[PDB]
Write a protein that binds this ligand. Sequence first.
Ligand code: ATP
Ligand code: MG
Ligand code: MG
Ligand code: MG
Ligand code: MG
Ligand code: NA
Lengths: 76, 72, 116, 151, 65, 65
Amino acid sequence: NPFIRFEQDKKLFRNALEVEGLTKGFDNGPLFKNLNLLLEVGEKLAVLGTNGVGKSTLLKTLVGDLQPDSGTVKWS
Amino acid sequence: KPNILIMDQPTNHLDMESIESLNMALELYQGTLIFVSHDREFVSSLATRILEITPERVIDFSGNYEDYLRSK
Amino acid sequence: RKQVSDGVAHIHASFNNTIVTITDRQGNALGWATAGGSGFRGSRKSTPFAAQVAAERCADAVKEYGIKNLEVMVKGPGPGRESTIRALNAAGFRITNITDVTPIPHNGCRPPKKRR
Amino acid sequence: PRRRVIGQRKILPDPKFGSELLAKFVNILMVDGKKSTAESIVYSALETLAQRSGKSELEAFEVALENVRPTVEVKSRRVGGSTYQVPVEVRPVRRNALAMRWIVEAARKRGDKSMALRLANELSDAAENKGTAVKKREDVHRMAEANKAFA
Amino acid sequence: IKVRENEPFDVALRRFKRSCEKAGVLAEVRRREFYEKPTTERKRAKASAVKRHAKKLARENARRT
Amino acid sequence: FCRFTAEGVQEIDYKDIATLKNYITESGKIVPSRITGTRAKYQRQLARAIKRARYLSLLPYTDRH
RNA sequence: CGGCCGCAAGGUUAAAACUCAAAUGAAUUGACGGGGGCCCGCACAAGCGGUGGAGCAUGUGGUUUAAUUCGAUGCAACGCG
Ligand SMILES: Nc1ncnc2c1ncn2[C@@H]1O[C@H](COP(=O)(O)OP(=O)(O)OP(=O)(O)O)[C@@H](O)[C@H]1O
Ligand SMILES: [Mg+2]
Ligand SMILES: [Mg+2]
Ligand SMILES: [Mg+2]
Ligand SMILES: [Mg+2]
Ligand code: NA
């Protein structure tokens, strides 16, 4: 059993993303339309789905490997 | 030591004995995270703010995932 | 299997639990669903509503036999006495008649003493 | 209280729309004894909510706030050594009062901009059984229907 | 104890047979014999019924009502 | 009240089942004299007759056997 | 202690030295009860806002001082004389 414990160098207070719209669909009809949500420094939000729903590309557009076709994300 | 962990799929290759350590660390974590791990008793263990994606309708915060998977 | 048509549903009520079973007319058990074996551990299983969950859970695990008429005989002192014979009317089984078999000694065995 | 029975309080109708229900909503989110500022936030909240739904008030405040009011809550009933909560029914007058005190509470979190935007973005989500306010309806109601064994 | 009410019952309502044994005997026969508490419990029982005849004589209380 | 045995002054027997069945409940127990109204003398013969009737299996100890 | 009875546990008959000015019975007025019944008060419940978390003002204990004047110090002392 390894002993892993992620600490925190600095604590965030208000929120993280405040995402409004992405309009991200690679070639076919967008797998998601609006996706306007916040975090208020929340937790978890376990995205689920079947093999081919778009969780990883959503995460990539969220971090910055890719960017949404139209919209913005912006971190704290 | 980051504030927000994105952690696409952490339970991919783990030992099921490192899975327990990962769960302990995630529960003890006081920062922020998102993740899309498909494991059942991982989201059941920690998740509370489900963001269910689906080509036509997306679900945002049904609850603690148990109301979710008992309604559906 | 074997498609038994008419069966018998013993109701083992008690001050601590309510064991609900369904058996054929010759006493060969088919399936049972106790109140505390349905997520009601603690003081909760000593409640009338906790016995209903026992009855509903016992409607299944015997549905394969296809029971349409039930003879229900109740036992023991407890609250899971009425709330499980009403729940047997709604689950689909038609209650032919209701019996209360209960061991009432003719002043025989000496009871315990263990409460102060 | 103990002996007497209190009748009621007569509240002035809301100025812009002569409705008594909106005035009670104004007071609930009004803090520090500043009614002048409270009405500014409330009207702006329905201002940016009527256009979203398409109609003025019958959808902005009636349906969207009847999706959050609870019908059964729980209260403690310690009588003879008990510490459980027995579900009860909530009066029609109190049903609304719980609703507005929840939308305001759910809009006090979720810090985006001035309270006009935070409250407006919360009244909308309550129209489709989505927002945090309707989540607390589930929180109370699921806890009510979980402990149905007591009555 | 048995109830049939052959065709049109749909209603248990076996209070007619409920109120013979189980109400008293099953919740009393589980302890406490001691052979002398019953003779002082019953003695204070039917001594607690005789004064009810004394307050059947308590009609002649004016009370101005 | 006691208008069942006070006139026919005799000693009850265990063969007259048609009259004993009027002094039994549906569970099989003996009906007390408080409800029926039988005098104290004939009750101690009514109780005696029933306990003989049960032994010969002309009556049941309990409603089921 | 002695006598008698008893397999034993013990029973029965049965004192004295020394010490106190009381011990005890029934009843009365209160007080009290983790006794009973009724009733009231921001007492609880239903709500709003504070204290306890931090900087400062003030008072008090302690500690120090040559002096840190004296008094108040449960509720009813501690922004009190
Ligand atoms: N490069 C790509 N080309 C085509 N479709 C893609 C591509 N990347 C993602 N997708 C689509 O996006 C959907 C969601 O992306 P994602 O890869 O997260 O899906 P997933 O199968 O749920 O996740 P994963 O298998 O990575 O755990 C996929 O189901 C797939 O149809
Ligand atoms: Mg013992
Ligand atoms: Mg004495
Ligand atoms: Mg302090
Ligand atoms: Mg003094
Ligand atoms: Na993915």
